[PDB]
Design a protein around this nucleic acid. Structure first.
Lengths: 352, 255, 253, 253
DNA sequence: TATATTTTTTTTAAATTTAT
DNA sequence: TTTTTTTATAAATAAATTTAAAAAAAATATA
DNA sequence: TTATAAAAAAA
């Protein structure tokens, strides 16, 4: 959760963003932050109010949404892996307390909104407060196991494990809407992987190497800039926005030289700093070993998956059967390789 | 400073007709050795390694190495203005924001001095090793266009099988299985209807059909298609222009 | 079943004629010919086909088999064949694949094509062989001119028969149209012009979308044998030269 | 009114020249010949068609008949006429039907064709003969390629007149197009030679969609007469072979 | 047979409710 | 004179289904 | 996790 970094890339270096279409990633192994997907499907999938459930009162919008999105990405040749967030770090707790205060005040407007009688505000502040549990991620990993599509459990941060997965070459690119994966160290970052059309949502492919080439920076330089735009792991300056962070990073290289040149009368310096441990955690988080995990996209199971998806969820079994048939049809097809792994780049060529 | 007078302008017209729909924006690498192009597809499957050497040009001179960025849809739309017998002169100057195309018909009087605004394009050049391809199939170009179109009528993949007796173009689709077989036609003397196959290892590879249909728009350049390929090596579709250079088309295999 | 055509452009023009009229057809392969009876997608126009066995080069038929073929798919596969291609229709008794073998006239390229056959066997409606009052044996491109140039102005032609000439009368909303031909039994030109065998007058209102579907068989035959009577569907013969014939039927409005 | 015409391709190319510009117009048919002075559906360009009665073969005309035809509809009627058919127009006093009769060259097909006309407002603009300072006599194919190939660059052409030759310039997103034409003073074939008569040099800007609609008339003649002067409509004249002319008009941009 | 040139198929991006 | 927190706001979807709509390959016509 | 228009504040 980085404040305005997408606007900074869209203003400074438009060549770093390659707005592609959903079928263009037809051979790429893709690591997905699964928590963004579960939060996307537990908010948008609604029918005028309550979350789309079964008759047992079990929340099951995220399973049907990930079922549709994941089979629509096997249809376009994406081989995904969903990386799940585990225990949050100690520096996450300040923004977690801020988000808990936001959900508490959203609970307060939900308390005064049920007595108001307005049904739009009730479903709106039900969309404002969603908390994922162990049971949602457990049935999410169960559906991924029954679809034959692998899941990875991060020890600290799923964006950090995604950026460690891309850096080890196990997957081509990280898939989150966040700019955290650029900070944690993924060279290629994908965005907006939904099931939509060409005009509606393009795929914002963020290349970190193009960002570091255009800004003239490297990995520890971009982390300090990403702190100065207000990351969740620390607190930025009140007087320094995006463009002033660009000018001060291009003036002072490390963040300690920014500490070595400030005035407290003009620029309000936040006391009790967290930037050293935030820099040491964005550079060096604790993650899983990506070389020790083999990624296999196996054949989807059929009868246990249809009894799991309809015996306790009361779902349209023909749509589930057609989705497993499309996953099994598109899984066994011949994938098309690229020319990036056959011929190597000897140098770029600009315009003159 | 870059003056490239080309008498047979139909060659450059057919090059841009071939290149208008595969790649949409290419960077022409102009050197003193000749006009070159090395640009990939937007989906990173196909590569257009185009060269046009300085010997076939009627009047070619360039002071330094130049790399203009050209919208190829725009260059095809401005090169459709020239006829099939126009002498086409490429003119670019110092700090070239525009490229001037001069179409002078020999028997007629039209001095068609067009200009084209260039593009701010930054693409990459890739080093191609001079590999010894195992199965090299020299065979007629309109036959290759017929094979690629009539197997794209069935499906989306052609499984090219090569052997000593001939090359087999098999395409599995929803209608059925179309196995186009060819024979080695070096025993029967023909002037251009010759399937000359130089095979070292029997290769059996699968290629796409949208990119092969994009490749077979280069068929009015020459009557020879040099299908150079090997096992897990990308296919080379070379259109050897008799005047200068060769239009080489690269294609990654399907797995 | 193995039918080898020296002139495979005949079967190419047959499937270019029947690619848009009927979609799925039942090729009733006889021991002495290739037969087909099917109706269109709206079940109003009847198509009859007969490809005789002596027009083929090599023909064998060990069993009377009725293949069910989507003609759009086999038309797309016959679009792969050239206009000079030797076409062999290999089949299998147990396997439902029609191995279309297109061979080049020179011995350098052979192109084998299986296709997937479904099962569509329905009750064919056998026409009774009856005498026809007005048999117009007229050239094919002239009839293509009639069908397209009267479908430009209307949706119905009201064909009138007479001894001196046949009149194709269209009275659509854009205007009136009366194209009247002239009787000539190979008198002036080198091939056979409009020959009318008229006994009783014919005054029937017809359709033009189905006649536009009918006139796509005009590269097969040089002549069209329009035979019709009062309140019967007309017979549009496309007599293929020493290979067989192709019929079309359309009820009056 | 009756106007037999042994070469129907001229009237066919007239109606393929005017069906894109004008939807509905009044054919001012008089005793001196067929006249059509009408303004298009977008109300920008004026078309002056004059077909003289001396060019027709059997022309008779009683009064001044002004019938309002539909150009797309009777263009679809002239689709039925071939390249070589003899077109015989026919009309009456009390009737509002433009009876069209097409005759074969070998006299075997008679294609009667009536119309359902409707009345329209008779608007006669009547641009007088302003003295054009720069008159250019271009071939049909050269002007067709110039308009059709500068139309891909921009929607506006810049025509420049000089003693050495005419300059066709066009700008836009597609760079800058700029075409010279050297004035060949009767040294080549006279159907190919470009002759310019210049009094003062003329530099004007015209649209290119309307010029594409004008240069659709290029099958009619081998010579196009472009007449230019300052702040007047541009004459794009198509001199039909001894059968009057066809003049277009376009205000400058 | 290029060279366009309209017709007409073929996607395909809109805009609805359902996906309980 | 732009920039920057700083607000209290808004929001995270994809298929079942037509349906009007815009291209994109078919099939003439023509020079 | 976003994305906004809006607005006082400030370099």
């Amino acid at each position: 959760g980085i404040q305005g970094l997408a606007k900074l890339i869209a203003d400074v270096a438009p060549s770093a963003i390659r707005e592609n279409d959903i079928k263009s990633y037809f051979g790429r192994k893709v690591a997905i932050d699964a928590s963004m997907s579960i939060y996307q499907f537990l908010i948008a999938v609604r029918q005028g109010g309550d979350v789309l459930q079964n008759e047992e009162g079990e929340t099951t919008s995220h399973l049907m949404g990930m079922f549709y999105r994941t089979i629509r990405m096997m249809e376009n040749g994406i081989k995904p892996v969903y990386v799940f967030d585990g225990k949050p770090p100690q520096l996450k707790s300040g923004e977690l307390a801020k988000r808990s205060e936001r959900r508490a005040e959203a609970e307060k407007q939900l308390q005064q909104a049920q007595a108001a009688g307005a049904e739009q505000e009730v479903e709106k502040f039900t969309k404002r407060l969603v908390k994922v549990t162990k049971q949602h991620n457990d049935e999410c990993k169960h559906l991924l196991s029954l679809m034959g599509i692998p899941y990875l459990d991060a020890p600290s941060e799923a964006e950090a494990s995604c950026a460690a997965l891309v850096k080890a070459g196990k997957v081509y690119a990280a898939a989150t809407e966040d700019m955290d994966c650029l900070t944690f160290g993924s060279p290629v970052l994908m965005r907006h992987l939904t099931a939509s059309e060409a005009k509606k949502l393009p795929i914002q492919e963020f290349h970190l190497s193009r960002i570091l080439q255009e800004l003239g920076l490297n990995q520890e330089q971009f982390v300090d800039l990403c702190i100065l735009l207000g990351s969740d792991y620390c607190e930025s300056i009140r007087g320094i926005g995006p463009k002033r962070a660009v000018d001060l990073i291009q003036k002072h290289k490390s963040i300690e030289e920014i500490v070595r040149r400030l005035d407290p009368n003009k620029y309000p310096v936040p006391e009790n700093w967290l930037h050293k441990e935030a820099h040491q955690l964005f550079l060096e988080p604790e993650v899983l070993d990506p070389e020790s995990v083999e990624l296999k996209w196996s054949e989807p199971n059929e009868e246990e998956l249809i009894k799991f998806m309809c015996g306790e969820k009361q779902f349209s079994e023909e749509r589930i059967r057609s989705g497993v048939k499309r996953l099994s049809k598109s899984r066994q097809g011949s994938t098309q390789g690229r020319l990036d792994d056959f011929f190597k780049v000897t140098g770029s060529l600009s315009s003159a | 400073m870059f003056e490239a007078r080309l008498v047979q302008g139909s060659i450059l017209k057919k090059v841009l007709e071939a290149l208008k729909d595969l790649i949409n924006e290419a960077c022409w690498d102009i050197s003193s050795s000749g006009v070159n192009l090395q640009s990939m597809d937007s989906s990173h499957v196909s590569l257009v390694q185009l060269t046009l050497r300085s010997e076939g040009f009627d009047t070619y001179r360039c002071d330094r190495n130049l790399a203009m960025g050209v919208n190829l849809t725009s260059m095809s739309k401005i090169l459709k203005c020239a006829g099939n017998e126009d002498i086409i002169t490429l003119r670019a100057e110092d700090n070239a924001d525009t490229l001037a195309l001069v179409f002078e018909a020999p028997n007629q009087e039209k001095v068609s001095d067009y200009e084209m605004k260039l593009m701010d394009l930054d693409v990459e050049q890739l080093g191609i090793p001079e590999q010894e391809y195992s199965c090299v199939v020299k065979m007629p170009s309109g036959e290759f266009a017929r094979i690629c179109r009539d197997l794209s009528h069935i499906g989306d993949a052609v499984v090219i099988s090569c052997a000593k007796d001939g090359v087999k173009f098999s395409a599995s689709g929803e209608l059925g299985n179309g196995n186009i077989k060819l024979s080695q036609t070096s025993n029967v003397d023909k002037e251009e209807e010759a399937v000359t196959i130089e095979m070292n290892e029997p290769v059996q590879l699968t290629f796409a059909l949208r990119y092969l249909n994009f490749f077979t728009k280069a068929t009015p350049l020459s009557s020879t298609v040099t299908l150079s390929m090997s096992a897990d090596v990308p296919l080379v579709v070379e259109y050897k222009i008799a005047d200068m250079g060769h239009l080489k088309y690269y294609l990654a295999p399907k797995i």
